[PDB]
Specification:
part of a larger assembly; 6 chains; A mainly alpha; B alpha+beta; C little secondary structure; A: mainly alpha; 2 helices; C: rod-shaped; Major capsid protein (chain C)
C-alpha cells in the first residue's frame, strides 16, 4: 500500500507532455518574415534584394 | 561556336522563309545570350579575375563575393587590419563564405594627422569565369532558341499582353507582364538552374 | 594573442618659434599577432593479476 | 504520423512537394457532455428537498 | 558606407550597348511608326465591344511592347 | 543507345521534313535528358570527383554535401579541428548526413538505365519542342484568343503543358 499505486497514469501523462515540450522546443523554425519573390527577378539582383532586406 | 545561325533558322521556322536578314539575327542572338547570363548568373569568358573590397557582413564571417569564384580556387584576402594575406576555399554554386574570427595579425597605425589612422579597408582578389571550355548545358540553349523564336516575329506592333495575378489593377489598365522571354517558355526553361 | 608594438614614431621636430602650428610626424605600429599552444599525450596498459 | 513525441522526425515541420494535401483540425470539445448547467440545478433540487 | 567625390563613370568605352537599346528602342520605334495614337486596340484584335468602358487604358499609345520590359530586365 | 533517333522521328511523326536535322534533334535529345535527371534525378555524368570543405555549426554536425555522391562511395573529411581523416558511407538518394574539408565523387552511370516511365515524358517533351517555339502563345487545344482583359499564359512553356513534369512525378517522394 503505497501512493505509487494510483499515480501511474498521471506521471505517464506528465512525461509525455514534457516530451512534446522538448521536441517542439528544438525543431520548429524561430524565423519570421517569410519573403517570397516572383519568377522574373534576374538572380543576381534577387540576392541584392535579399541583402537590402 | 556556341550556336550557329542554322540551328536558329531551323528551330525557329525560318529556314525556308527568312522573315529576318542575317545581321539582325546576329543582333538578336547577342541579346539572347546576354539576357540569360545575368538572369541566372554566369559569363562567357574564363578566368575573370576580380579585385574588389569585400565587406564582411557582421563578424561571424558573412562575406559575400559578388562573382561566385571557382569551386576550389583559394580566394585571397588583404587589408582591413589583415597584416598578412590569407587564402580561402569558397563554396561551389554559392558565394556565402566565412571569415575566420581568429585574426593572424592586426597591423594598426595609431596616431596620424594625415590619414586620421582610420584603416585600409578589407579587400579580396579572386577569379570568376569557372566555365573554361564553355560547357553550358542545353537548358539555356533551348530557352535562348525560344527567345529568338519569340523575337523574330514581334517587332513591337501587336500588343500581346497576358494577364498576371487575378485582381485587376484599380487603374483599369490592360494588365502587366507583357515581356519577351517571360511570356514565352524561356523562363520555365532555364529555371532548373536558378537556386 | 598579444601586442607587438613595433616602433614609436618621430613626433616632435624642433620647429621655429614663429609659426602657429606644429608639423605632422610618423606613426607607430602595434602588430596585434597571436600564437597557439600544442598538446602532449600517450597511453599505457596493464593486466590486473600481473600487477597485483 | 511519425512526428509524435518520441518519433523518428519528431517536432520537425512537414514538407509536401506538389499534390497539396489539406488538413483540417477537429475541435472535439467534449467539455459539456454532462450538461453542467442542467445538472447542478437538479442536484440542488434533490438536496434542497431533503432539507440540506 | 564609409563630403564630395568626383569619379569617371560609364562602361561606355568600347561602345557597351548591351541589350536595352538593341531590343527596346527598336520595338518602341516600330510601335511609334506603325501604331500612332488615334484608336484603342485589343489583344491581336482591332476592338472588343464589351458593352461598357473600353479597356484602352494603356494599349492606345503607351509602351505595351516588350521594350520597356527589356529595359526592366537590364535595370534589374 | 538510350533513345535512338528512329524512335523520335517515328513518335513525333517527323521524318520527311529536312527542317529538323540530326544536329538540332540531338540538341533536343540532350535537353530532354538533362531536365529528366533534374526533376527526379538520374545522375547523367561519368564518375566525377569533387573537392569541397564543410562546416561545424550544426550542434550534432548536420553536414549537407553540395553534390549528393553516387550511392555508397566513402567521402573522406579532413581539416577544421578534425585530427585524422575518416571515411563516411552516405545514404543513397539524399545528401543529409551527420558529423573542415572533404572530397567525394558524383558520377553514377555505368549500366544503361531510364526505365520506360521516363522515356514517355521525354518523347512528349521532344514532340513539344519540335513544333512549338517561343512565339504565338496559344490557348485551349492550341487555338488563339481575343480575351479583352489579358491572355491565358504559361501554355507555350515546355514539359509542363505536355507530359514530362507529371509523367515523371511517379519517381519522386
Amino acid at each position: 500500500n503505497t501512493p505509487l499505486q494510483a499515480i501511474g497514469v498521471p506521471v505517464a501523462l506528465y512525461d509525455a507532455l514534457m516530451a512534446r515540450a522538448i521536441d517542439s522546443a528544438d525543431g520548429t523554425p524561430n524565423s519570421k518574415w517569410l519573403v517570397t519573390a516572383s519568377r522574373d527577378l534576374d538572380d543576381g539582383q534577387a540576392k541584392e534584394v535579399k541583402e537590402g532586406i | 561556336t556556341l550556336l550557329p545561325l542554322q540551328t536558329i533558322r531551323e528551330h525557329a521556322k525560318c529556314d525556308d522563309n527568312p522573315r529576318v536578314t542575317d545581321d539582325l539575327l546576329k543582333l538578336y542572338r547577342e541579346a539572347a545570350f546576354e539576357a540569360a547570363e545575368l538572369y541566372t548568373g554566369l559569363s562567357f569568358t574564363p578566368e575573370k579575375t576580380i579585385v574588389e573590397p569585400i565587406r564582411l557582413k557582421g563578424r561571424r564571417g558573412k562575406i559575400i563575393l559578388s562573382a561566385t569564384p571557382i569551386a576550389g580556387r583559394p580566394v585571397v584576402f588583404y587589408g582591413g587590419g589583415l597584416g598578412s594575406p590569407l587564402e580561402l576555399i569558397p563554396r561551389p554554386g554559392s558565394n556565402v563564405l566565412f571569415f575566420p574570427y581568429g585574426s593572424p595579425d592586426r597591423f594598426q597605425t595609431w596616431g596620424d594627422c594625415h590619414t586620421c589612422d582610420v584603416e585600409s579597408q578589407l579587400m579580396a582578389t579572386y577569379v570568376t569565369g569557372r566555365r573554361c571550355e564553355n560547357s553550358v548545358p542545353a537548358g539555356i540553349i533551348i530557352g535562348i532558341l525560344k527567345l529568338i523564336a519569340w523575337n523574330i516575329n514581334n517587332p513591337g506592333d501587336e500588343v500581346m499582353s497576358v494577364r498576371n495575378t487575378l485582381n485587376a489593377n484599380a487603374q483599369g489598365l490592360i494588365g502587366g507582364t507583357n515581356n519577351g522571354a517571360v511570356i514565352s517558355g524561356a523562363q520555365d526553361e532555364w529555371f532548373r538552374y536558378r537556386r | 594573442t598579444y601586442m607587438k608594438i613595433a616602433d614609436y614614431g618621430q613626433l616632435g621636430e624642433y620647429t621655429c618659434d614663429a609659426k602657429c602650428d606644429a608639423e605632422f610626424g610618423e606613426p607607430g605600429n602595434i602588430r596585434h599577432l597571436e600564437g597557439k599552444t600544442y598538446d602532449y599525450r600517450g597511453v599505457f596498459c596493464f593486466n590486473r593479476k600481473n600487477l597485483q | 504520423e511519425e512526428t509524435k513525441p518520441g518519433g523518428d522526425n519528431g517536432g520537425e515541420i512537414i514538407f509536401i512537394a506538389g499534390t497539396d494535401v489539406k488538413v483540417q483540425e477537429m475541435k472535439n470539445d467534449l467539455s459539456d457532455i454532462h450538461s453542467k448547467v442542467p445538472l447542478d440545478d437538479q442536484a440542488r433540487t434533490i438536496a434542497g428537498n431533503f432539507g440540506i
